[PDB]
Write a protein that binds this ligand. Structure first.
Ligand code: TQC
Length: 182
């Protein structure tokens, strides 16, 4: 409808795949080469399904901060025959608050879905499904599930992936440039 949805659409069309683990379906954001992110609660194993194709996982790392606290981001390298468009220059360098954000979700149940969630707070600490978690972004999200792995963008920045909600708010794990320096 506007430049928010325009940026979101451009990220969803080129940089998302459908990931399926034993824990269900996830929006998965490709960042560069064969490297993607998914919420840690997806429990990635040795094999994952990518757009319904059996794919060997070459490496998978559940990120934690330097206090050894969960960040809820798993970085996955996929044994895929094709690279993602490099979107590392759209990642923020520092923890921040944001205006006018959009959550975008791509699944086999919820095709091409874009939610204007609006103002995003640097919330920080959250007890997420019983797990102490840091670098949480918080927004208004009065709904249900199937969003997990959904990508949170502003105009010009990819700022997080959706990891949960309490029926009134939604929560995203920050994406930072320094996670994907190589
Ligand atoms: C139905 N569904 C499936 C995935 N996401 C949603 C959804 N519904 O409403 C919303 C928010 C509440 C205001 C817009 N998200």
């Amino acid at each position: 409808m506007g430049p928010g949805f325009d940026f979101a659409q451009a990220i969803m069309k080129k940089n998302t795949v459908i990931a399926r683990t034993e824990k269900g379906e996830f929006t998965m954001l490709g960042v560069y080469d064969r490297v993607a992110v998914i919420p840690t609660h997806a429990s990635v194993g040795e094999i994952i399904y990518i757009n319904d194709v059996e794919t060997r996982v070459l490496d998978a790392c559940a990120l934690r901060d330097l206090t050894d606290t969960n960040l809820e981001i798993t970085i996955v390298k996929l044994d895929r025959n094709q690279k993602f468009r490099d979107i590392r220059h759209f990642l923020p360098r520092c923890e921040d608050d944001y205006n006018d954000a959009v959550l975008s979700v791509h699944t086999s149940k919820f095709p091409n879905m874009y939610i204007p969630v609006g103002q995003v707070t640097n919330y920080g600490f959250l007890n997420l499904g019983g797990t102490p978690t840091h670098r949480i972004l918080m927004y208004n999200f009065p709904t249900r599930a199937g969003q997990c792995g959904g990508v949170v963008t502003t105009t010009g920045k990819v700022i997080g992936i959706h990891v949960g909600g309490n029926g009134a708010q939604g929560f995203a794990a920050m994406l930072l440039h320094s996670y994907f320096t190589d």
